[PDB]
From a paper:
The same grid preparation strategy was then applied to other full-length OdhA samples, i.e. enzyme without added ligands, or preincubated with either CoASH or succinyl-CoA, leading to maps at comparable resolutions of 2.1-2.2 Å. In all cases, the maps, which showed well-defined density for most side chains, allowed to trace the OdhA polypeptide chain unambiguously starting from residue Pro102, corresponding to the N-terminal boundary of the E2o domain, with excellent stereochemical parameters. In contrast, the full N-terminal OdhA segment, corresponding to the first hundred residues that include a predicted helical hairpin analogous to the one observed in the crystal structure of MsKGD, could not be traced due to the lack of supporting density, confirming its high mobility in solution. The E1o active site at the dimer interface showed a clear density for ThDP-Mg2+ in all cases. In contrast to the crystallographic structure of OdhAΔ97 which fits the resting state, all our models refined on single particle EM maps adopt an activated conformational state of the E1o domain, even in the absence of added ligands. The state is indeed revealed by the shifts in the loops 566-579 as well as 809-836, that could be traced in the EM structures but were mostly unstructured in the OdhAΔ97 crystal structure. The presence of a bound acetyl-CoA activator, most likely acquired following heterologous overexpression of the enzyme in E. coli, may therefore explain the observed OdhA activated conformation through a mechanism that involves the stabilization of the loop 809-836 in its extended form, promoting, in turn, the activated conformation.
Contrary to most organisms in which three enzymes compose the 2-oxoglutarate dehydrogenase complex (ODH), actinobacteria rely on a two-in-one protein (OdhA) in which both the oxidative decarboxylation and succinyl transferase steps are carried out by the same polypeptide. Here we describe high-resolution cryo-EM and crystallographic snapshots of representative enzymes from Mycobacterium smegmatis and Corynebacterium glutamicum, showing that OdhA is an 800-kDa homohexamer that assembles into a three-blade propeller shape. The obligate trimeric and dimeric states of the acyltransferase and dehydrogenase domains, respectively, are critical for maintaining the overall assembly, where both domains interact via subtle readjustments of their interfaces. Schematic illustration of the reaction steps involved in the oxidative decarboxylation of 2-oxoglutarate with generation of succinyl-CoA and NADH/H+ (ODH reaction), with emphasis on the catalytic steps catalyzed by OdhA. These include the ThDP-dependent decarboxylation of the 2-oxoglutarate substrate followed the reductive acylation of the lipoyl group provided by E2p (both catalyzed by the OdhA E1o domain), and the transfer of the succinyl moiety to the CoASH acceptor (catalyzed by the OdhA E2o domain).
Residue numbers in the entry:
A (entry chain B), B (entry chain A): 349 to 1220
Write the structure that this text describes.
């Protein structure tokens, strides 16, 4: 059992052509670059049958024209090993000790010279010898891991737990990293992980009490929100503290909630870290909250969310100082082996796309694992980049504890069954080298078992409760009754002037200058448009002292060239952000931050959801280029935004701004899918709205920000109505009207006793119906608008209908096809809530498999047909 | 304007320590590895202000301790340039000519030695000098590209076209690749691409007639399906032929349809290629259909679907022999620059994760572009791997033709406005070197303009039609009236015996052997379960002579250990596929292929959709591990499966198998989201079903395969009912019952005149209600099952209800919450279709924000409450 190729027999060759010193330097370069291909990193003696084996002929001395006859000759090596001269025997010895034992390293692809040199120097010095106290501490942690697993196996046989047996070195690796961070003087560590070994990490790394875990297994579950539905035990989070064992440091440790969908926690935990860093406010030399992210081998290579999230690492609004990644490589999926899972040689090969180092380590050598953890945390602090660790290990049982893995992998489980564990091997090694006594070794086991037995007995004394029905979360948070959302006239004029107070030699571009002038004049003369209404809301909130963040694709300028939140000078390329300047000059330390995202919907929306969880007092908004591209983030909408409160008691106030409207631009630029969002709503989980005037959009945003109802808000924003002059607002609507309106009654009814038809509408189709009513002179019609879709404002609709006592018909008019839009939701729910209302009649486009037509002339013909049908 | 650093002044150094020959070899290695960092590949003199600049100190002779005083000394170079000895002046000259001009190359990261050597030899030989005929052919193609763009600009000013101006070298690059493939003797080329330059590619590469394109712009659109909705002009496909200009070869060229969602065509076009290759059947040395895939720079770096699809390249059921990728790098998104779009240095850096070569080429040197196209197509044919081309160019106008790019990028558009085009520059170069006359150069322009003017005038003679309403696609395909789907008794016994005809020294695993015995005995005694029903269907179809493909996560064994389509011997690890063996021994050349996918839902489902489009006569099925993970493929469901026929006239017969059932395993293992699928249905777009017996599943699958209705099928499959003994089927149900049943009436009604309540149910909740009816002895109840959900079988439901003439109530009973499951769809539609039916009453779980509870005791309490409510 020796892992190297034997030395071969050959004749001595002459020193002609390429010199032999050149050949020895080429050998040094080969080991530094490709020596990981023959390193002892696998605990099993296993080669997977269907995977390609890379060529490694570069690592034998024959390929470089050297022979056994050169081993005692001396050569110039140019500073290798801190020496100018050396023998080929000593060169080979050093190379093999550094690059072919229990740690394999990839770092030669890095472009910067100082980075490469730092890693090279530390890997060739070697791992320093640990003290006896340190060695005993590693043994305590290994014991805890294995003992906990065995206890659960014995007391709860059938129950699913997802064990860590085979990979118990993870616990001392994570401990090493957290301890190193505490010594650097940092503030917090945030963890995200999957199912494999979660209950072990909660107890041994985070510090969740043992009583809690035992209760979970007996069927008593901790309640997150009053009347909540809940979730399985391996999807929950917790908080704790970690004290340094051989030091005076202390750090905080947190673990985040997640669903079963793998790798969906990656963008969410990055956002939590960024929000925490921003609150501490320590600058570029800060970055004092560390992200620690765990993966599995099949998931890391397969799912596309992983590289999509790593691509945000060095961008302006997303940087968090680097991420430490750990891949638990146990050489198996569920019933699938690596030959069917990836087309890369290693699972961690995405690192080479981003220019980052990789360390592969044997999971049956605990002292090497502790060294790699320390080295990774030091690299992050110095260079501010991502680092990847590959922990090679195995899975002792099946995928779960009810499965038989021999049916599909017979030969692999001949090697696994009946091995000795990593705790047993390490105890034998320490007693052999005389580093531990037998009394000590036996105490370590006895003490921990007594602790667990004690707690278990205490938990069984208390009787088990019986099942009870779950009520719901509708009334678990209060509504802001009697809150006023208007600003003063002085405040409005100051916001307007921000666009006139340009810096010293700044000028606007000629096509942007008219927009700025209109903003300064409109706050006294009238004609405020949609974009200016939105910015007035965010600006007012930043003045009071809040952090406002807006992110999305092309969101600084606007997709429809409407926003201009940051302006650029054509002559010098200088930038200007008016509303941020005004906020910083009022002495409440408010901020307005606008960022242009990368081209992603899954990672984008996930990052903003996380920001809202990490700072409860911030105002965060994500914008989509068109609302039709939000189906690329369906996982986040379904698993986090719509359902997080009911499952885990985790609350959010994220704002989604989704453009919507039927204007003839085709099926992928027409519908944000209102029907889908209204399906997900129940128990008052989120607010859904489609306003028709800038002032009403202003009041909606301010009500959300100043209330104490911590639930999301989904708004459907316009595209063509952005520049419609019938939709503009007057200053009195921002300063004298006090509240947001959920139903707007018709403002052009002469006599209410002559009305015989009521139309209900939502959005931009109002302005067409109104136009036609004026032209034809109809005094028997009244058009009523619905601005808030969920919850249903049934008291207001009832009040409006009651104001027309001679009405015989009610029509519901929409632009969307009959199987889309708000009609399906309203035809089900509204008749129950208003019993005395006449039967409703739909007027819409016909039902369709697609969203809209692709021909523009057909669009115009349909619109004419629709409006004609409404007016008899 | 010289691009190199000047030679510096220094003293001569002594030849001590590391020898100077060693230093010259290190310089050669540096240029081969990192010389692309200083190559002349950018047409503009532009450096983006916020992007990091890599260190390239390795490429100057000072860092290797050499000086101007060494330039005329001679050194040993070890075969470089086919010489044993050389001067430092000649070495530098050759390195700079090979690695620093108009082509930059990355290939040193490749692990195989023979690959590296092949590339190295071809890049150092250089580009061969082209003939005069070849040169004139390149000028014709450049002219065509630019001329077409200018014509459309002039005749249709406001209209959106997404121009290729700035990147006209794409047309000769694509032409070079297709021409090289025709010379190799291959069969077809399949293209997928986005919006940028689509109408140009349709006319100049594929061969779509010019009349068609002009008509599109005048508002006359070609119809795909009778009564279809349509789509915008830059989303359509076409077919054509390509004849070799200087050869006797011929090849077929195809372009595929796609939506606006970027990069969603990547898995779909890979599947089309695989299906075409399988039909030709030429073996491992075949692979004679070439995939050619075009991208943009922002999309390639940002979206996660790109690397997810490249990861399928070398897997067993997905390999297509390599893909040629072209990235059109025009240094801008919409209003976003590379500093805000990626954290990689180049957009094509994913190549280094997969071990593939990259070529960067200047888009203003057309002869170099034609060489790189040829070299890439040769590499694919020899090594069977992916290859990446980065075409560096610019965008002359805005994102569309209505946008002003100076508002956000002032300095970049000072360099662009008023340049001379690539056609103009090339004409000037050829007239300078005397390779073309002026008469020739003027004819090239005049002839092409005359051609276009002719066609345009002909198109305007015919009058323009007026708009007309679109009818729908419901009746555009026929239903299979009077088709019988039963097999003979002889056929059933033969299928059973397949599991007894093991190979010579094969034995089953002890936990798989009982399943095999039961399969052999059940075809004569009874008790056929769900999995065996499914396999009997697929086997029967493979016997008749069809290619059957089944793919999904853990689909060979089954997620619930139920299928066992391939078995493994514990002693030798040999594999056995019974139903494939039987099919190949009947002389119709049928196949049963089962594959275990990688861990992806977006790329998985997309690949199977593509397979169904590329071979209309195959039976393809995709399976999900649980139906709750299908929201990861929402883009494919919404943009291709649900809506492809109505938009493009593209038909498919894909089968989705989605597990579903409420059994207490929590919110991410309970619901496949039936309500979402029933929203997407209209105009008879697809079939949705939830059967309750194995025999009925058999008949459904066979009806779909033998009919002429080319639409998808979505089935909701069980989890616990897989092993329920009340649900098993008898042999007569496969051989004497002729058709699939859409409604199954109650089989335990003694007297029909005593019934006073009818319950409607779908799925596994039948077996609980039936149980309770027997126990309590209720003869006033009748339970009726609905097996097909869409379309609604309203004639059968009416017939069933009419059979109970004294009924007073109808109850609709489901397990799902009230805002989920089939109730929302049925409460809207069924009362209209059956006017005389009593008012329906819902019995279900309460409405919820999440899918299901996380506590198991609460699940059991809810189920009891539900069944009690049903029975008064
Ligand atoms: C979904 C969420 O975010 S929380 C909703 C929780 N409650 C429910 O779902 C209960 C069922 N729903 C209902 O009874 C009704 O739909 C109501 C009461 C919410 C609204 O019906 P109406 O009375 O017709 O609506 P109206 O617009 O007059 O609202 C009444 C008050 O509720 C407030 N309100 C209503 N919806 C919201 C909301 N989403 N956020 C904040 N305040 C709200 C209004 O500001 C108003 O306050 P006021 O006292 O200052 O006038
Ligand atoms: C959705 C698709 O893929 S095709 C939809 C095309 N048709 C429509 O949408 C019309 C509207 N729908 C209807 O009129 C009704 O729902 C029907 C006629 C389709 C079915 O209603 P019922 O008559 O109650 O159902 P029933 O099960 O008896 O079907 C009658 C016949 O249609 C056939 N059929 C019904 N649905 C399908 C289907 N999805 N695929 C194949 N055949 C079908 C049955 O096999 C049967 O044929 P038979 O005469 O040989 O026995
Ligand atoms: C998005 C998604 N797809 C599929 C699944 C189903 N699933 C659960 S575990 C698993 C295997 C995971 O393998 P690996 O990442 O190696 O984890 P290990 O069990 O080895 O820790 C799969 C496919 C899932 N939970 N989420
Ligand atoms: C999935 C998706 N997200 C967003 C968009 C909106 N969008 C259309 S074009 C575009 C810019 C694409 O940039 P690039 O890939 O460089 O294309 P180019 O315009 O340079 O050809 C964006 C974000 C889209 N069509 N699809
Ligand atoms: Mg694994
Ligand atoms: Mg671009």
């Amino acid at each position: 059992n020796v892992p190297y190729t034997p030395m071969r027999w050959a004749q001595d060759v002459p020193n002609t052509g390429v010199d032999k010193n050149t050949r020895v330097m080429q050998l040094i370069e080969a080991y530094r670059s490709r020596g990981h291909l023959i390193a002892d990193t696998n605990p099993l003696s296993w080669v997977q049958p269907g995977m390609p084996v890379p060529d490694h002929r570069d690592l034998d001395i024959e390929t470089h024209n050297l022979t056994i006859w050169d081993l005692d000759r001396t050569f110039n090596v140019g500073g290798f090993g801190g020496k100018e001269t050396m023998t080929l025997r000593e060169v080979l010895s050093r190379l093999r000790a550094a690059y072919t034992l229990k740690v394999g390293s990839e770092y030669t692809h890095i472009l910067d010279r100082d980075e490469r040199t730092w890693l090279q120097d530390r890997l060739e010095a070697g791992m320093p010898k640990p003290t006896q106290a340190e060695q005993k501490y590693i043994l305590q942690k290994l014991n805890a891991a294995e003992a906990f697993e065995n206890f659960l196996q014995t007391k709860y046989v059938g129950q699913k737990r997802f064990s860590l047996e085979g990979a118990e070195a993870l616990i001392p690796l994570m401990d090493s990293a957290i301890d190193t961070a505490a010594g650097q003087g940092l503030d917090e560590v945030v963890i995200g992980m999957p199912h494999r070994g979660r209950l072990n990490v909660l107890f041994n790394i985070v510090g969740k009490p043992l009583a809690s875990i035992f209760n979970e297994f007996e069927g008593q579950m901790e309640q997150g929100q009053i009347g909540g539905s809940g979730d399985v035990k391996y999807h929950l989070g917790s908080e704790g503290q970690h004290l340094q064992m051989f030091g005076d440091g202390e750090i905080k440790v947190s673990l985040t909630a997640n669903p079963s969908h793998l790798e969906a926690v990656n963008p969410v935990m990055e956002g939590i870290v960024r929000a925490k860093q921003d609150y501490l406010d320590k600058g570029v030399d800060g970055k004092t909250v560390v992200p620690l992210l765990l993966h599995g081998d099949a998931a890391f290579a397969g799912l596309g969310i992983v590289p999509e999230t790593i691509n945000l690492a060095k961008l302006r609004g997303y940087d968090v100082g680097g991420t430490i990644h750990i891949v638990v490589n146990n050489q198996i999926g569920f019933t699938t082996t690596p030959d069917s899972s990836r087309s890369m040689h290693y699972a961690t090969d995405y690192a080479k796309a981003f220019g980052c180092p990789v360390f592969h380590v044997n999971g049956d050598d605990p002292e090497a694992v502790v060294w790699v953890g320390q080295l990774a945390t030091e690299y992050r602090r110095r260079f501010g980049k991502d680092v990847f660790i590959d922990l090679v290990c195995y899975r002792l049982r099946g995928h779960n504890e009810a499965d038989d893995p021999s049916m599909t992998q017979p030969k692999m489980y001949e090697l696994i069954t009946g091995r000795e564990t990593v705790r047993a091997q390490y105890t034998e090694d320490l007693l052999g080298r005389g580093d531990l006594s037998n009394e000590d070794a036996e105490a370590v086991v006895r003490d921990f078992h007594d602790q667990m037995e004690s707690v278990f007995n205490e938990v069984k004394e208390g009787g088990k409760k019986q099942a009870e029905a779950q009520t719901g979360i509708t009334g678990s948070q209060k509504l802001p009754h009697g809150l006023e959302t208007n600003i003063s006239r002085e405040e409005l004029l100051e916001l307007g002037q921000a666009f006139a107070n340009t810096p010293e030699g700044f000028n606007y571009h000629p096509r942007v200058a008219p927009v700025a002038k209109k903003r300064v004049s409109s706050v006294t003369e009238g004609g405020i448009d949609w974009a200016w209404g939105e910015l007035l809301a965010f600006g007012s909130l930043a003045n009071s002292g809040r952090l406002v963040r807006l992110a999305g694709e092309d969101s600084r300028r606007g997709t429809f060239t409407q926003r201009h939140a940051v302006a650029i000078d054509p002559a010098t390329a200088e930038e200007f952000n008016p509303l941020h300047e005004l906020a910083q000059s009022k002495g409440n330390n408010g901020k307005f931050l606008v960022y242009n995202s990368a081209l992603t919907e899954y990672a984008g929306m996930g990052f903003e959801y996380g920001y809202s969880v990490g700072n409860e007092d911030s105002i965060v908004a994500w914008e989509a280029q068109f609302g039709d591209f939000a189906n690329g983030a369906q996982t986040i909408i379904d698993e986090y935004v719509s359902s997080g409160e009911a499952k885990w008691g985790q609350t959010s106030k994220l704002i989604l701004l989704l453009p919507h409207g039927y204007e003839g631009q085709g099926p992928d630029h027409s519908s944000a899918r209102i029907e889908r969002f209204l399906q997900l709503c129940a128990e008052g989980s989120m607010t859904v709205a489609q306003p028709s005037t800038p002032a009403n959009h202003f009041h909606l945003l301010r009500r959300h920000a100043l209330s104490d109802l911590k639930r999301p808000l989904v708004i459907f924003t316009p595209k063509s109505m952005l520049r419609n002059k019938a939709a503009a607002s007057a200053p009195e609507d921002f300063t004298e009207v006090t509240k947001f309106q959920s139903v707007i009654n018709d403002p052009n009814v002469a006599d209410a006793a002559k009305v015989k038809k009521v139309m209900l509408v939502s959005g931009k189709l109002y302005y067409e119906l109104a136009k036609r009513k004026e032209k034809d002179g109809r005094d028997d019609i009244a058009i009523v608008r619905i601005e808030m879709l969920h919850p249903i404002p049934f008291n207001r609709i009832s009040e409006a209908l009651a104001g027309y006592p001679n009405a015989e018909e009610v029509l519901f008019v929409q632009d969307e096809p009959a199987n889309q839009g708000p009609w399906p939701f309203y035809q089900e729910h509204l008749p129950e809530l208003i019993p005395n209302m006449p039967k409703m009649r739909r007027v819409s486009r016909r039902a369709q498999s697609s969203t809209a037509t692709g021909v523009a002339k057909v669009h115009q013909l349909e619109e004419k047909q629709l409006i004609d049908e409404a007016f008899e």
